[PDB]
Amino acid sequence: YAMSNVLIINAMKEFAHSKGALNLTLTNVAADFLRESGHQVKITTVDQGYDIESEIENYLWADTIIYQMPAWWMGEPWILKKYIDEVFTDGHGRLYQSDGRTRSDATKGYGSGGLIQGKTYMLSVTWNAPREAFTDPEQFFHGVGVDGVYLPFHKANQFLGMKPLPTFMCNDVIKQPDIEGDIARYRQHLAENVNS
Amino acid sequence: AMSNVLIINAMKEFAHSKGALNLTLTNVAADFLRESGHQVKITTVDQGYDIESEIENYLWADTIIYQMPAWWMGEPWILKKYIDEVFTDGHGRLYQSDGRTRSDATKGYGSGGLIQGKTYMLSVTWNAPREAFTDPEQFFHGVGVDGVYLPFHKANQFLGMKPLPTFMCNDVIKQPDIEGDIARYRQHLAENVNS
Ligand SMILES: Cc1cc2nc3c(=O)[nH]c(=O)nc-3n(C[C@H](O)[C@H](O)[C@H](O)COP(=O)(O)OP(=O)(O)OC[C@H]3O[C@@H](n4cnc5c(N)ncnc54)[C@H](O)[C@@H]3O)c2cc1C
Numbered sequence: 168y169a170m171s172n173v174l175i176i177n178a179m180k181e182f183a184h185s186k187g188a189l190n191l192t193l194t195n196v197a198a199d200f201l202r203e204s205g206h207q208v209k210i211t212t213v214d215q216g217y218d219i220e221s222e223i224e225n226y227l228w229a230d231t232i233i234y235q236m237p238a239w240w241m242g243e244p245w246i247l248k249k250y251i252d253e254v255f256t257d258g259h260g261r262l263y264q265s266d267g268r269t270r271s272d273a274t275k276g277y278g279s280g281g282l283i284q285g286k287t288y289m290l291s292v293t294w295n296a297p298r299e300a301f302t303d304p305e306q307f308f309h310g311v312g313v314d315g316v317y318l319p320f321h322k323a324n325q326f327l328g329m330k331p332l333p334t335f336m337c338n339d340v341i342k343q344p345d346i347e348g349d350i351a352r353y354r355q356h357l358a359e360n361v362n363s
Numbered sequence: 364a365m366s367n368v369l370i371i372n373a374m375k376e377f378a379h380s381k382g383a384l385n386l387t388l389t390n391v392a393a394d395f396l397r398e399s400g401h402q403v404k405i406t407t408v409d410q411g412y413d414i415e416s417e418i419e420n421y422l423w424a425d426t427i428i429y430q431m432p433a434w435w436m437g438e439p440w441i442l443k444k445y446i447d448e449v450f451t452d453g454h455g456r457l458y459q460s461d462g463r464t465r466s467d468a469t470k471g472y473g474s475g476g477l478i479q480g481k482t483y484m485l486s487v488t489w490n491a492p493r494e495a496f497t498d499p500e501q502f503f504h505g506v507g508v509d510g511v512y513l514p515f516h517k518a519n520q521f522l523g524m525k526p527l528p529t530f531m532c533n534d535v536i537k538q539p540d541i542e543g544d545i546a547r548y549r550q551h552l553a554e555n556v557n558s
């Protein structure tokens with residue numbers, strides 16, 4: 168005997184042709200909308216630094232983890248890979264227990280040794296690439312979709328026991344900025360997938 | 364005319380990874396390739412690097428081999444940092460654009476590379492068993508090692524390069540097999556890197 172607890176991990180970074188403003192904006196849009204909607208929200212700003220232990224506790228507290236990030240060389244910026252390499256690993260015993268296999272039947276069960284089953288996660292990504300690069304079979308990603316491109320990132324999260332919510336993506340963000348459209352679409356996405 | 368080979372060793376001592384298998388395989392490749400007549404250069408990512416020198420190394424190389432452990436389903440963060448710095452700073456030399464240099468912006472993404480003709484190869488070490496990649500009911504839904512490494516492949520292909528077949532060692536923690544790893548890797552190099 169409110170709404171779901173949400174942790175937003177903002178992986179914005181000012182570097183070369185990325186200035187981090189779109190990712191900061193979408194982080195704030197989600198935080199404000201979700202809070203308005205009744206969710207408690209915590210925000211981690213990766214590039215600013217973080218306390219590994221606190222982050223592990225944040226995952227345990229969260230019902231849903233949103234990764235807000237730009238696309239850097241087809242995936243997460245290095246700062247976010249460092250964050251999971253530190254946080255997930257140090258989370259051994261609390262976020263996951265094992266690889267889910269037995270030495271007895273070693274070919275089976277990989278990825279079933281998580282401890283945070285029940286929690287969900289969602290990718291919110293920003294790309295210079297057009298949406299068609301992911302869906303047109305003759306284009307760069309051979310039709311595998313955004314979730315095919317992010318398959319290893321998805322699987323790192325699923326190894327802990329989590330399941331994904333549908334991915335949100337903004338495309339052509341450099342050549343054809345559409346902040347108003349991004350915000351409207353994102354609010355709609357959050358209303359459908361994160362609010363319940 | 365054996366290919367110039369750049370080996371990028373992304374080993375890192377951290378938590379349960381001691382880096383020894385990746386260092387061993389880096390050496391196995393360097394020695395075998397040198398004996399076979401290739402010029403070889405080695406970048407040890409965790410020990411540090413000069414970005415300009417690395418850009419020059421890619422231009423020098425005919426084939427780039429990434430020797431790396433699997434960390435959270437992919438490359439260690441140090442190697443993602445290496446490409447985020449080197450590939451980006453290499454704009455104008457390693458790649459020119461995203462390939463959309465004419466009116467039709469929904470098309471051509473990834474065709475703006477500059478190092479077409481060069482090849483790259485992944486040499487990876489995993490605790491996961493080989494069946495996790497191939498058995499359709501297992502974790503990776505049968506997409507294979509190259510499906511798991513899709514984004515890393517595509518980062519390299521955006522520069523214009525094409526892959527050689529991937530080499531993988533599996534169950535490296537619970538069931539080490541250094542002798543087998545070495546024999547299999549030499550065979551893989553002979554078939555794919557030697558010409
Ligand atoms: C190293 C590196 C690698 C990359 N690799 C890839 C890749 O592999 N694939 C790919 O598709 N892209 C890639 N890019 C592009 C990258 O994805 C984009 O730069 C990033 O998504 C932009 O997000 P940002 O938060 O940095 O926004 P910013 O760069 O700050 O802003 C982007 C645009 O949105 C506008 N904007 C942002 N916020 C607001 C606001 N609140 N109001 C009005 N306008 C706003 C800005 O004015 C600007 O026009 C890469 C970039 C770098 C630096």
Ligand SMILES: Cc1cc2nc3c(=O)[nH]c(=O)nc-3n(C[C@H](O)[C@H](O)[C@H](O)COP(=O)(O)OP(=O)(O)OC[C@H]3O[C@@H](n4cnc5c(N)ncnc54)[C@H](O)[C@@H]3O)c2cc1C
Nearest residue numbers: 380381382383384385387432433434435436488489490491
């Ligand atoms: C943060 C982190 C995340 C990880 N994520 C994943 C993952 O998502 N998926 C996955 O499958 N695995 C993962 N692992 C496991 C990781 O892939 C292995 O630890 C790595 O491949 C081992 O390679 P290494 O070079 O560090 O070897 P080491 O750890 O140094 O050695 C591995 C074994 O090989 C032996 N060995 C090495 N070289 C020799 C030699 N020359 N002679 C005799 N014996 C030798 C060692 O004694 C040891 O038994 C992760 C590990 C870490 C630390």
